[PDB]
Ligand binder design. Structure first.
Ligand SMILES: CC(C)[C@H](C(=O)O)[C@@H](O)C(=O)O
Ligand SMILES: CC(C)[C@H](C(=O)O)[C@@H](O)C(=O)O
Ligand SMILES: [Cl-]
Ligand SMILES: [Cl-]
Ligand SMILES: [Mg+2]
Ligand SMILES: [Mg+2]
Lengths: 363, 363
């Protein structure tokens, strides 16, 4: 029968980049003979506007019915005044990850051939290339530990957060990182702060337990502060990074910016049953919404990753990725990936999606 | 009467860079007429070897008697096998900061004129320069919060750490950052994760309270993940960074590596009474110990910062800083700051300290 995908475009540039993803997906469906049905739901600011909250119960029910979620991005100035709790990102993302038990986040990032000069790294460093998959534990640690809150008053008012991890939680995310490394370059770098945090001591211990089953994968451990330095100096030496929730938030961002090409980057958030949400690493960029200049590649690649990881449609995911590569390598670029003297030749969001969709067809 | 300085050279390159600092200090004492008495104590690995622990009670008593501590660096492979608890860094640094209530850490970092090309940043970014003072809260947050430890067994064995901050703790570190900014470029960027952590919500709240007293200082807040990205893209736009304990550990390291010149960088750790410990940001670098090639500038500048901050000897601190600048600007460089084709002309650790000491004298 039909695959089912819930589409949660969100705010800002979400809807316009989503239209291009839907356009490429349709080419893929025709080429591979796939029956996929789509249903659309509000989330983030458009959900606050139509329903009073950023994650409506009907949107949760709709995601629950689907095999995966193709997600855009949420947030905008319209909602920034609200309490931390009621806002599009915190109010939709954290509840979605807890609700669907999405303990696995994967952010692939590489310098694409021919676009290494976009990196903010010195040219002798960026020309060496890099390709780093960040595996981040997404439903544990300090994001969801209890107790959390505040007590007390005046100068003695105090807040607290609790970072907690169990062996079962660390084992499952570490297995993902070692499995991923087996299909890449067989190296995992686990990022922790084991000279300070009890949680990191246990993290490092359990990752060493898991690593016994993968002797052909090199394991190394690095402290979070040093990691931010070593990603500047030698990013070509890392393959998979394995991080807790807070340290993976930080490392994946630094690596994303090291690409210089964040409009290409996508994010996988998956549970143990293979259900997942797939979305650009970049945000809703409300400053360019509706101008038709946003780079749709991150949203289109989020759809390829949805086909590979949730639907196990490997050839279909490969086809989208090949088509994107063709556009980038043929220099068919949106404006943020061009120099100021070439920027007048930027391709629009629609031109990009048209090229990519045509390439999937042409086979 | 005499000022009193406890000298804790530590392991690896500590003693050799310390000899150069002592050499410059002696020039300064003669030029400014200062009476300073020094006493030496073991800490870190040499203290483990002579006394069985990395922070002997007699070393604590000796620091307590002194007006400030000129500290080297601790750690080495000889001690890496030991339990996390018993090792030179964790065992000496964390106890020293708690013991002496050193809640204020300050790490100044700039691209020095004429050495911008050392940065790992693209040349169009590094040539714009940067000068960023990181103010890091050093005795609170998750480093020292309780409860911390583990319970449970097998797959349900779990560890925990607690991040805690009070209004009094945030106020005092924030005042340092705003005062510092008043004498610099009047901008504080406070780094937090207030979309996730209760402690960051309170941090941001208290920093806004403190900021009312300094309306001529620009305040902005940035999330830790985004900060690691924005330091790559626009480091010339930051002046003072104000961070909690874990986020300041991370941001100061990334900025240090962005200099490309970590052998120049020093660290201030101070209590509310003006007592402090002053040390290189870089480590004991056991791989080059005794080879007489280590760059002593970080240790020598740690002594200038000891004179300015603990002893309020502003002209003496200025003199050391001018003398260092003279060496760097005259191209009198140790090897790690030279290209491979010029590296044969590296100056030794002693040559550096001699030049700098002579410059202080020459006035
Ligand atoms: C919005 C925020 C809660 C979120 C997180 O911290 O995970 C974001 O930074 C991310 O990386 O997806
Ligand atoms: C050694 C470690 C405990 C220490 C810290 O985390 O503060 C170090 O990274 C530092 O920055 O001084
Ligand atoms: Cl965490
Ligand atoms: Cl902290
Ligand atoms: Mg993030
Ligand atoms: Mg550190």
């Amino acid at each position: 029968s039909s695959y089912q995908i819930a589409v949660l475009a969100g705010d800002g540039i979400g809807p316009e980049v989503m239209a291009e993803a839907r356009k490429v997906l349709k080419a893929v469906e025709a080429r591979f003979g796939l029956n996929i049905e789509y249903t659309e739901y509000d989330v983030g600011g458009i959900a606050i506007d139509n329903h009073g909250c950023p994650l409506p119960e009907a949107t949760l029910k709709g995601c629950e019915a689907a095999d995966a979620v193709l997600f855009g991005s949420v947030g905008g100035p319209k909602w920034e005044h609200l309490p931390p709790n009621d806002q599009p990102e915190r109010g939709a993302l954290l509840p979605l990850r807890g609700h669907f038990e999405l303990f696995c986040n994967m952010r692939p990032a590489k310098l694409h051939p021919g676009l290494e000069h976009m990196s903010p790294l010195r040219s002798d460093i960026s020309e060496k290339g890099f390709d780093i998959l960040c595996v981040r534990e997404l439903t544990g640690g300090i994001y969801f530990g209890k107790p959390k809150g505040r007590q007390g008053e005046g100068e003695n008012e105090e807040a607290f957060d609790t970072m907690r991890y169990s062996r079962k939680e660390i084992r499952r995310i570490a297995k993902i990182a070692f499995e991923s490394a087996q299909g890449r370059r067989k190296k995992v770098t686990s990022v922790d702060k084991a000279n300070v945090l009890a949680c990191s001591v246990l993290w490092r211990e359990v990752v060493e337990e898991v690593a016994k089953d993968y002797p052909d994968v090199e394991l190394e451990h690095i402290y979070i502060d040093n990691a931010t330095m070593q990603l500047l100096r030698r990013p070509n030496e890392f393959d998979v990074m394995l991080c807790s929730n807070l340290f993976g938030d930080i490392v994946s961002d630094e690596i994303a910016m090291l690409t210089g090409s964040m409009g290409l980057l996508a994010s996988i958030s998956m549970n143990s049953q293979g259900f997942g949400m797939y979305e650009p690493a970049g945000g809703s960029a409300p400053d360019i919404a509706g101008q038709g200049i946003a780079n749709p590649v991150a949203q289109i690649l989020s759809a390829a990753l949805l086909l590979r990881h949730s639907l196990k449609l490997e050839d279909a995911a490969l086809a989208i990725e090949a088509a994107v590569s063709k556009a980038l390598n043929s220099g068919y670029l949106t404006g943020e990936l061009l120099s100021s003297d070439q920027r007048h030749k930027a391709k629009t969001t629609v031109q990009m999606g048209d090229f990519i969709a045509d390439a999937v067809k042409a086979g």
